[PDB]
Amino acid sequence: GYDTPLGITNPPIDELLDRVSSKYALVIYAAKRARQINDYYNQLGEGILEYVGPLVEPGLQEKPLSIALREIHADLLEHTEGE
Amino acid sequence: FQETTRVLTDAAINCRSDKLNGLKENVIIGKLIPAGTGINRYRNIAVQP
Amino acid sequence: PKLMALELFKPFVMKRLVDLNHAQNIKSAKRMVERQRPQVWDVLEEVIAEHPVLLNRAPTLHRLGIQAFEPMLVEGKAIQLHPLVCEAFNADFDGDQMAVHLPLSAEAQAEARILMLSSNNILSPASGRPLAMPRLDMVTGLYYLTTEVPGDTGEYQPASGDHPETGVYSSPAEAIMAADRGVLSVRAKIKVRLTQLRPPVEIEAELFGHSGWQPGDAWMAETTLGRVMFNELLPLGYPFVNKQMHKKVQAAIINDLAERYPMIVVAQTVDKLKDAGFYWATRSGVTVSMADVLVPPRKKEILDHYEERADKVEKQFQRGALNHDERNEALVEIWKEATDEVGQALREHYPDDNPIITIVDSGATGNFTQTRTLAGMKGLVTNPKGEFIPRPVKSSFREGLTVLEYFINTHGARKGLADTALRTADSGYLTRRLVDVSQDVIVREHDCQTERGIVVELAERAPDGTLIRDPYIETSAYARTLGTDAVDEAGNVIVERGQDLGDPEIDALLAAGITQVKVRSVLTCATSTGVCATCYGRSMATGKLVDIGEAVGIVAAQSIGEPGTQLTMITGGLPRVQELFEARVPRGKAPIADVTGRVRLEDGERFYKITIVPDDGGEEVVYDKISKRQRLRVFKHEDGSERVLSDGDHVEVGQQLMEGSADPHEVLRVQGPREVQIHLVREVQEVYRAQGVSIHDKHIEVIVRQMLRRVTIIDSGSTEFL
Amino acid sequence: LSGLTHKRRLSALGPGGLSRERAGLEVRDVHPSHYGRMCPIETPEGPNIGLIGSLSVYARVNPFGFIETPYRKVVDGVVSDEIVYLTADEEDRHVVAQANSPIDADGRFVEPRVLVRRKAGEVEYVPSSEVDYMDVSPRQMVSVATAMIPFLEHDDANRALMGANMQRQAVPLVRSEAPLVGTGMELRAAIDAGDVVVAEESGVIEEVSADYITVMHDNGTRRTYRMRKFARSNHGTCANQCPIVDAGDRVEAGQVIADGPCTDDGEMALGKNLLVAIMPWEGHNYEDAIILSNRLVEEDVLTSIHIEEHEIDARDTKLGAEEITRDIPNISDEVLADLDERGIVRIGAEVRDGDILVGKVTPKGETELTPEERLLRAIFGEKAREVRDTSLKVPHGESGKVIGIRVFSREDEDELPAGVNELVRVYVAQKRKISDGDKLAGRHGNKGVIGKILPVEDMPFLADGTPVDIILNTHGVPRRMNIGQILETHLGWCAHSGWKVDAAKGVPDWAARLPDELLEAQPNAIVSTPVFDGAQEAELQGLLSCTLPNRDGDVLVDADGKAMLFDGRSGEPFPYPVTVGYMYIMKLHHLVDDKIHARSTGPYSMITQQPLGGKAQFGGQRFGEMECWAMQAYGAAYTLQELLTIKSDDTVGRVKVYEAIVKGENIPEPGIPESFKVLLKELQSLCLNVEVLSSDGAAIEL
Amino acid sequence: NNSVPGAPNRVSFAKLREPLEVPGL
Amino acid sequence: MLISQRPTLSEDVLTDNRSQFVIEPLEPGFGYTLGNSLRRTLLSSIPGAAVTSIRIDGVLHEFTTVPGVKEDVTEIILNLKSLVVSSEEDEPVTMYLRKQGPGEVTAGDIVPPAGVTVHNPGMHIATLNDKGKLEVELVVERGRGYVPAVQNRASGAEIGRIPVDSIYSPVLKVTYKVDATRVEQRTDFDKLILDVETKNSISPRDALASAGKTLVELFGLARELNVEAEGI
Amino acid sequence: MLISQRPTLSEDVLTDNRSQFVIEPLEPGFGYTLGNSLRRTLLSSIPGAAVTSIRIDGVLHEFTTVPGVKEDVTEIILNLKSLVVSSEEDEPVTMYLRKQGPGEVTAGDIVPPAGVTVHNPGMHIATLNDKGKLEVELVVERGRGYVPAVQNRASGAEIGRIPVDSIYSPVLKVTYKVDATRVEQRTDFDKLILDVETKNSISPRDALASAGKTLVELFGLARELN
Ligand SMILES: [Mg+2]
Ligand SMILES: [Zn+2]
């Protein structure tokens, strides 16, 4: 129940934290996936498709971190916490 | 903090060694501070679709 | 500014520029950026779409001194800052500057977008009270909007014979239409029919039988159109608030929203409130002029009376009866009384429509002492040596001070300007030391399964009244986990063990009649390194249980050191805090009852000699106290501060006798760690609350825990330790 | 004013004096003996508070060095015309009255009890016979700068200090305008500052031009005054002297002939008169911000001229002699079009950021060219051109015309430093119009930064269609306690509109004490309120009800000084009347253009390898420990690691990250700061075996 | 009472006469 | 002259009754100039019809409540004031609503004369108990804008005449905002965001079209004073 | 109770440059908005002509002086900023000013080309000694709004050119008052009295007509929706 968020406040932070134990885990959860997406884009030209690109279809020139957050919010990723 | 020369002499005499588990030492050395996102609990996370 | 953004985002811009084929190679792209060709601005706007930047305003004094904002290109050469974050940055737009950084790697961007974003920092870490809320000009606008004035235009009137009642509107839209036409004041008593605003609990339980209000269910409301317009800003489902929006009311509303709603909704509603307050501050008609600053009508008579009394005192001195000191004391007392009298007369004279009164009473900014100075009597003023001068200034800043009065007044201004720098330096030093001590306090565990817990009084039950909420329950036991279940008189459990305390749980505990509650505290934690999250309890900024890995020592140090700047003056100012944390011998060094029993004191005019006879048995401990001080209240069943230290009474062990501050080491020696911890926490909290600032106890429990963490050994025996 | 104050400074620090650290805080306070000798208000705001002051207006220094002040002795209750100068001791052995004390026209004290200042700073009443000395003017305790703040007696000491300090930062505008309301110190300050040429002898002006003026003295001797124009001052501003006399006009000795910077007809004028409306407006003037009309920008009301100065020199070197030439190695002809045959920019040529200003070639030694560089040199036919490029160029953030060039040559027998043969300095003049971020301030210590510059059609306008030139928030006036601001606004409106005190029935009660010449004023008149003796509240209240109507025949402001404005956007009148009036606004020298800094990658220090550089590449912003604590509290571990390793000290990490950003790859892992390797080497040099060891204890290499 | 010959005429709310003119600053 | 970038209007739909109209881009400063006048024109210039006064034979005055009805007389006035009516007759035509017995009375139960109509027959007016009745006479008159009833207090002389504030408008709430736009380096062009909510009598698009028609007709007065070169 | 009579506009003339326009009857509460719309469009969107740049013989930049004149180049530029001209041509045109010998040079000494005229021949530009002369060439262009002098900075012209800030705005002051007729009868309206003063470049009637055409063309977009 709220007006649609716009900018870097989308997706809403509470809905993201609903899926991760704590924000300190969420930051890594998003950063590692952003690195994976960036590596996939870098190797798009030629290379083994070991890193799978974005799951949710990206927008017109959307940053890898934003895509990572959006696909985290869509329940398409799984993470295991160290120690 | 204070009295740098005296503490250096004392440490050299005692041959004391300090663990790098504090925020200040990690900041000085360039290591991730052992708080927030720098603890191995959160640093070592495996994420795949 | 686009110039700074271009010079700061240059590598990203140049990569995208070569990518779009505008430039053939990196060298050409760099040359193009240097020359600032028109092709660059589109790429620059395209490359900072969602790239947060960190804004820092030195001297960063607490955690919220660094925020992360989404950049936007703007003309000019000044960084546009949001009105609400100035409270956190402590920034006034009078030439202040703040540096802007830029996180590059994905991890840094995620850190600055998840943790440091300005939308996630509505609540202050120190006390959990909203820091990004309508502050100075928004408060005045909202206060004007939500005020009710009687006998206005278009107010509700009852049926009169053949004339039906007027002022009943079928919807807020009709009320707005009437206001636009000009037949209805925004703030007048009206009876509107609301449909998209939830009624208050009292009305909700009656009209709908608590069945549940849903949008589309109409209920008659008696209020002013201003309040209806205000509540439209609050999130749907929030019960209708029908009260004038003094600053405290706004703070309560914001805190409740933050407690019951996600932070995104809180940010949205805070922004909407800011917009409405700014819009309605322009039309509140608050200005300043000679007509608006009214002189008290009968100031001359009061001044003449008190001047006559002062002249009588002066003549009494000239008889030779009194020396300089008594004369000065009498004059200062008389002039303090005169200043208070003139202030009361001025307060009575002013109406409620003056811009000065509206600004001060609305809580927007300022206090009434400034109003009295500017329109009443500036009063007696300090001397460079620090003592009041017997001569007061009887002219206000409106009438105009004379030459001598202005010269005498300059002393206080010079003293304050000089002391500002020293105070800030001392606060910085104290913060540095506090950070150094509590470097190693980090939450390492989720729960230590410990049984120890400090017992903190919730609300003492008066002998006649059923209950009286403790004045500082908001700071002692508000965000603490419950160490043991609070069992009522019967077997029913009001709050289960381990459930974090809060407003509803505290209210339930008060209703059940329980007064003493044991709360898990960081000061009795069992974790070897750091402090488990359960013992530390609910976090302040987040509002939920503190998550593992969070550095609580740095937060505590920053919270304690932040209000040092405004912590103005046995000195009871910042030096009191510094000596209390340094565990030095207090200047007063009041004696303490070494052993409980009956007191047999002898009054020595030169040096007070105190002796106590233990009830159980033993000898009398002798204290040689100087006679130049004043006795403090003796602990008695009445506990009346006016009471004097009567001889032959019985005093509990560890209770001080004379005015001053007990030595922490002596109280620790005679009573134990629990009592010394209570003493330190209470003393520092008292010195902080005297000025007006509030910081939760746990932020001090951390420092005390790190402080009292050694065991002096007297005899090694079979241990290598010397 | 800034120079005049600087000359009359009393600095208590420096060689032979106390130091900031060693000096106690007790010496920084005011003393009852400062009355008349050292101004208790004017003082630096920074750490040098109380160690720097200024002579009072009437103070004269004794031969022994002790400061003196004038006092007119009263022999037997009758004040004497003759004065005597008393030092501190003589004053502390006597009974000194106050100038404001009501005095009969014959010198008789009307009040039996006269307020008296006596030894030890004591102030108390005394019979009118024991009094021995009396002051000369109520303005005897204030400095020159503090003596030109109207209604100073209504402003608090700290606000007055701030206003006095800010009056010395005003920038001289293109067109100066004297204040409508200002004390009597303006003219004397301007005359004694020395920036206005004043006729030495009485005569008749023969011919006056923009450059010079010749006046024929009565004794038959002509004298010509040369007026420096557009001459750079010590702080970058411009100093112009425009003659204010016409040919064939007799000039009396000591009369001003031309107006220097900040002067309007031989009286100090640091700012312009603007129509102020005091109210909050949409939050754009929130918390000390200021809203301005675009009419100020388009009319060049607050336009200023600043002159930069650059210089390069050709010094002889061991490898050869540096020379200035139009020819430069491998630069396109278009970039070198503006230069002249001698190798320096032609006068009057717009020069932009980074443009070449004077071309010089330095001798080169021997350096084998890189593969592709030498190959291209061979292919294109361009020889190596060993001589390097060291041409002076416009630094970052500079522009404007080239007003003048000054070249000194050793060949022409000019005194230059040893080892230097040719030195040329180019002056660049820039015209700045007020913009967002610039600072403005009144005389009452109420600063502000331009929050917005609204179009002339958005500003609130009076009932007759006159838009207001500036809007000031009302929440900062009563909290700061500088009501003199509002008093000045009211009196400025009264002066601008002109008044006509009714006298057909007789002078009103409130106007009994007004000077006979002050009962009428033409529109846009000039009035003065001397410090500590000026217009009382009753005077302003009476005058506000007697202002002349406009040309339309209607009075805009009410008796209370408030007027009914119209909303420039909605178009509907504001619900309540608003205070309006003309206020004197100055333009401080804290311009935004100088403050803006930005850095992405530039020069790096040598010993520390940290970011560093000049204005061409602005240095980085320091990230202190308090910032580090703030970052640690958030729990952000990677941001701090980057800020301290990958963009501060990592010599290879910086290059690697710059490669990563300019390419598509990710940012690599940071390395070890140089500030730690340096520490370890420095600590080893002290014969301290310092070695990092792992859990096993094995030493690791760094 | 403008000491300088050609001063602009700005009337003042001066109710007291200063017996001594400001010396050379 | 010429306009750099032509303004264009895009309709958005939030509900059948609501809408959001964005005009973009506009020369700097034209945002308010357009929006405020358009809002006032929409709210005050569009003609409509509404009930002006009511009659209740069963009650001699308004202090008490009409017998046999749960709702208070003021509540009935409030319900009937919200009735949406469309009238094509210039003169004020009378209407009668008659009911008997227990049940609820809805706006669809009123017999309308020729011309007038009711656009929400499902509306609720009041409720009736056993052996209850109510006959009310409500006149419907055309007009524009909002007119209070106190000004309509003086109207001839009758027994139970009860003037009621009539809303002569098919649009009942309009709001506007302006936001910065970047069509070039200027980055200062306005973006008017007009929000309009109407009754069921007129669609938001038709309401905006009528407002534009009226405003163009009004400014034609100035434009036909003389013909001069001007921007398009 | 629809109002039968639609609004009408009538021009009154108070002076050559000033006129009063009366518009009524208007719907209640609507006079202020219409008057303010007209005022806003009058002060910002009336096309006009103004001097764009100048070129003084012997002067390379504006921070200098020409021998013989009593004031520097900046002062004369500021004086010329007050000049009012009306150019019928839609292209830049160049006007000449050649004054020599002792005396004063005024705007009446200019000799504009065909299609241009100067409406204040009494303006004071500079003063000349018998020693020095003054020859100025200034360009007049037709536009609207306020164009900063930078417009000619990038033109890449000779060193002689001195770009000048341009103010194409013939309107000077605009004001309005509304005379509401609130009466107990339904017959309530309001009357508008729009005053407008100009710089003598154009008459008030032409300015009002131009503003009205602007607004009509702007509201055609709203009318189009249907
Ligand atoms: Mg500030
Ligand atoms: Zn624990």
Of the partner residues F7, F143, F219, the one whose CB lies closest to the CB of residue G221: F7
Q: Looking at the structure, tell me whether residues C268 and C323 fall in a common domain.
A: no
Report strand pairing: C621-626 vs C607-614.
Answer: antiparallel
Whether C549 and A27 lie within 8 Å, measured CB to CB: no
- Closest residue on chain D to F178 (Cα): D569
E strands within C247-347?
none
In total, chain A counts a number of residues equal to: 83
DSSP-assigned states of every residue in C589-638: ---B-SS-EEE--B--SSEEEEEEEESSS---EEEEEETTS-BPPP--SS
C92 CA → ligand 1 middle, Å: 4
DSSP-assigned states of every residue in D393-424: EPPTT---EEEEEEEEETTTT----TTEEEEE
Chain B positions in Cβ-Cβ contact with residue D673 (cut-off 8 Å):
29-30
Q: Sketch the domain layout of chain A as residue ranges.
A: 1-82
- Calpha distance C54→D35 (Å, rounded): 50
Q: Looking at the structure, tell me whether residues C186 and C311 fall in a common domain.
A: no
C208 CA → ligand 2 middle, Å: 47
Q: Which residues surround ligand 1, an ion (CB under 5 A)?
A: C 92, 94, 96
Chain B positions in Cβ-Cβ contact with residue D654 (cut-off 8 Å):
none
Chain G positions in Cβ-Cβ contact with residue F208 (cut-off 8 Å):
222, 225
Q: Looking at the structure, tell me whether residues C253 and C386 fall in a common domain.
A: no
Q: Which two tokens stand for residue D199?
A: 């006729």
**B/D interface, count of CB pairs below 8 Å:** 41
First to last CA, chain G: 26
Question: Which ligand lies nearest to the CA atom of residue C89 in the structure?
Answer: 1
C563, C568, C574, C577: CA torsion to nearest 10: -70
- Calpha distance D246→D258 (Å, rounded): 11
| Interface check B26 vs C, CB under 8 A | no
Q: Partners of F107 in the beta sheet?
A: none
Q: Considering Cα of C313, then C315, then C320, then C321, what sign does the dihedral take?
A: negative
Q: Are C132 and D327 in contact (CB under 8 A)?
A: no
- Calpha distance C281→C143 (Å, rounded): 9
Whether C193 and F78 lie within 8 Å, measured CB to CB: yes
| Interface check C54 vs A, CB under 8 A | no
C-alpha distances in Å from residue D544, one per residue of C374, D470, D499, G108: 21, 21, 8, 43
Residue type, D178: A
Q: Which of D640, D638, D610 is nearest to D627 (CA)?
A: D640
First to last CA, chain E: 19
Question: Which ligand lies nearest to the CA atom of residue D287 in the structure?
Answer: 1
D19, D21, D23, D29: CA torsion to nearest 10: 110
Burial (CB < 10 A; 0-12, 13-18, 19+), residue C361, is middle
Q: Are D83 and E20 in contact (CB under 8 A)?
A: yes
- Calpha distance D337→D331 (Å, rounded): 11
C497 CA → ligand 2 middle, Å: 14
| Interface check D144 vs E, CB under 8 A | yes
Residue type, C439: Q
Report strand pairing: G48-56 vs G134-143.
Answer: antiparallel
Q: Are D355 and D393 in contact (CB under 8 A)?
A: yes
Q: Which of G126, G120, G114, G102 is nearest to G54 (CA)?
A: G126
Question: Which ligand lies nearest to the CA atom of residue C93 in the structure?
Answer: 1
| Interface check D219 vs F, CB under 8 A | no
Which residues does B29 contact at the CB level (< 8 Å), separation at least 6? B20, D672, D673, D676
Q: Which residues of C are annotated as a binding site?
A: 92, 94, 96, 448, 525, 532, 535
∠ CA(F208), CA(F210), CA(F212), 5° rounding?
70
> Position of tokens 């649009």?
F171
Residue type, C540: M
Q: Which of C514, C538, C535, C537 is nearest to C526 (CA)?
A: C535
| Interface check D436 vs F, CB under 8 A | no
Provide the 10 A C-beta neighbour count for residue F206: 16
Q: Considering Cα of C251, then C256, then C259, then C261, what sign does the dihedral take?
A: negative
- For chain E, which chains pass the contact test of at least 3 CB pairs under 8 Å? D
Of the partner residues A14, A34, A63, the one whose CB lies closest to the CB of residue C263: A14
Which chain C residues touch F if contact means CB-CB below 8 Å? 38, 41, 45, 73-75, 159, 161-166, 168-171, 173-174, 176-178, 180-181, 183, 193, 220
Residue type, C667: V
Domain at C148, CATH number: 1.10.274.100
Question: Which ligand lies nearest to the CA atom of residue C92 in the structure?
Answer: 1
Walk me through the domains of chain G, giving residue ranges and CATH numbers.
1-47+169-226 (3.30.1360.10), 48-168 (2.170.120.12)
Q: Cis link prior to G25 (omega < 30° from 0)?
A: yes
Which residues does C285 contact at the CB level (< 8 Å), separation at least 6? C355, D574, D575, D576, D577, D578
Distance in Å, alpha carbon of E5 to nearest chain D alpha carbon: 6
- Calpha distance C216→C88 (Å, rounded): 40
Chain G positions in Cβ-Cβ contact with residue D243 (cut-off 8 Å):
70
Residue type, C101: H
DSSP-assigned states of every residue in D10-62: EE-BSTTSB-TTTS-SGGGS--GGGTTTB-SS---SSS--SSEEEB-TT-EE-
G169 CA → ligand 2 middle, Å: 76
Of the partner residues E16, E19, E25, the one whose CB lies closest to the CB of residue D144: E25
Q: Looking at the structure, tell me whether residues C152 and C278 fall in a common domain.
A: yes
Q: Which of G160, G211, G173 is nearest to G47 (CA)?
A: G211
| Range(s) of the domain holding residue C397 | 298-418
Q: What single DSSP character describes residue D169?
A: T
Provide the 10 A C-beta neighbour count for residue D371: 8
- Calpha distance C52→C42 (Å, rounded): 19
Whether D30 and C11 lie within 8 Å, measured CB to CB: no
H-type alpha helices, D33-156: 88-92
Q: Which of D629, D592, D636, D597 is nearest to D613 (CA)?
A: D597
DSSP-assigned states of every residue in chain B: ---HHHHHHHHHHHT----S-SHHHHHHHTPPPSSGGGSHHHHS-EEE-
> Position of tokens 């660059």?
C40
Chain D positions in Cβ-Cβ contact with residue G69 (cut-off 8 Å):
209-210
- For chain A, which chains pass the contact test of at least 3 CB pairs under 8 Å? B, C, D
Q: Which of C257, C247, C236, C304 is nearest to C277 (CA)?
A: C247
In this complex, whether G and F touch, counting 3 or more CB pairs under 8 angstroms, is yes
DSSP-assigned states of every residue in D293-311: EHHHHHTTSS-EEEEEEEE
User: Over chain G, what HEC string results?
Assistant: CCCCCCCEEEEEECCCCEEEEEEEEECCCCHHHHHHHHHHHHHHCCCEEEEEEEEECCCCCCCCCCCCECCCHHHHHHHHCCCCEEECCCCCEEEEEEECCCEEEEHHHCECCCCEEECCCCCEEEEECCCCCEEEEEEEEEECEEECHHHHHHHCCCCCCEECCEEECCEEEEEEEEEECCCCCCCCCEEEEEEEEECCCCCHHHHHHHHHHHHHHHHHHHHHCC
Phi-psi region at D22: left, alpha or beta (left = phi > 0; alpha = psi -120 to 50): alpha
H or E element that contains C35:
helix C26-35
Query: Best of D641, D661, D666, D669 to disrupt the A interface by mutation (most A CBs within 10 Å)?
Result: D666
C-alpha distances in Å from residue D379, one per residue of C446, D329, D331, D382: 73, 16, 17, 8
CA D533 to the chain's CA centroid: 28
Q: Which residues of C are annotated as a binding site for Zn(2+)?
A: 448, 525, 532, 535
| Interface check D506 vs C, CB under 8 A | no
Chain D positions in Cβ-Cβ contact with residue G105 (cut-off 8 Å):
none
Provide the 10 A C-beta neighbour count for residue C74: 16
- Calpha distance D582→G163 (Å, rounded): 32
> Position of tokens 């004149």?
G69
Q: Cis link prior to D523 (omega < 30° from 0)?
A: no
Question: Which ligand lies nearest to the CA atom of residue C90 in the structure?
Answer: 1
- Calpha distance D592→D436 (Å, rounded): 8
Q: Which of D218, C276, C182, C127 is nearest to G29 (CA)?
A: C182
Solved using? cryo-EM
| Interface check A64 vs C, CB under 8 A | yes
Residue C132's SS3 state is coil
Q: Are C549 and A24 in contact (CB under 8 A)?
A: yes
CA B19 to the chain's CA centroid: 7
Which chain G residues touch C if contact means CB-CB below 8 Å? 28-29
Q: Considering Cα of G126, then G129, then G130, then G134, what sign does the dihedral take?
A: negative
Q: Considering Cα of C123, then C124, then C125, then C128, what sign does the dihedral take?
A: negative
Q: Which of C396, C394, C363 is nearest to C295 (CA)?
A: C396
- Calpha distance C78→C96 (Å, rounded): 11
Whether D30 and C366 lie within 8 Å, measured CB to CB: no
Q: Cis link prior to A11 (omega < 30° from 0)?
A: yes
- For chain F, which chains pass the contact test of at least 3 CB pairs under 8 Å? C, D, G
E strands within D180-322?
203-208, 212-217, 222-226, 231-232, 238-239, 242-243, 250-251, 258-259, 271-278, 289-293, 304-317, 320-321
Q: Which of C365, C279, C94, C91 is nearest to D288 (CA)?
A: C94
Whether G174 and D465 lie within 8 Å, measured CB to CB: yes
- Calpha distance C260→D6 (Å, rounded): 61
Whether B37 and D636 lie within 8 Å, measured CB to CB: yes
- Calpha distance D576→D460 (Å, rounded): 13
Whether C106 and A5 lie within 8 Å, measured CB to CB: no
Q: Looking at the structure, tell me whether residues C278 and C142 fall in a common domain.
A: yes
Q: Which two tokens stand for residue G61?
A: 């930049």
| Interface check D665 vs A, CB under 8 A | yes
Q: Looking at the structure, tell me whether residues C235 and C336 fall in a common domain.
A: no
Q: What single DSSP character describes residue C79?
A: -
Domain at C370, CATH number: 1.10.132.30
Chain C positions in Cβ-Cβ contact with residue A28 (cut-off 8 Å):
107, 110
Q: Which of C641, C647, C606 is nearest to C627 (CA)?
A: C606
Q: Partners of D232 in the beta sheet?
A: D238
C-alpha distances in Å from residue C56, one per residue of C61, C62, C663, D636, D642: 10, 11, 41, 15, 16
Of the partner residues C107, C115, C442, the one whose CB lies closest to the CB of residue B35: C442
Resolution, angstroms, 1 dp: 3.2
Q: What single DSSP character describes residue E11?
A: E
Which residues does G154 contact at the CB level (< 8 Å), separation at least 6? none
Question: Which ligand lies nearest to the CA atom of residue C536 in the structure?
Answer: 2
Burial (CB < 10 A; 0-12, 13-18, 19+), residue D96, is buried
Q: Are C86 and C92 in contact (CB under 8 A)?
A: yes
Whether D455 and F29 lie within 8 Å, measured CB to CB: yes
Q: Are D174 and D432 in contact (CB under 8 A)?
A: no
Q: Are D95 and D130 in contact (CB under 8 A)?
A: yes
- Residue D26: CA count within 13 A, CB half-sphere: 2
Interface of A with D in 23-62 (CB under 8 A): 24, 31, 35, 38-39, 41-42
User: Over C321-378, what HEC string results?
Assistant: CCCHHHHHHHHHHHHHHHHHHHHHHHHHHCCCCCHHHHHHHCCCCCCHHHHHHHHCCC
Burial (CB < 10 A; 0-12, 13-18, 19+), residue G195, is buried
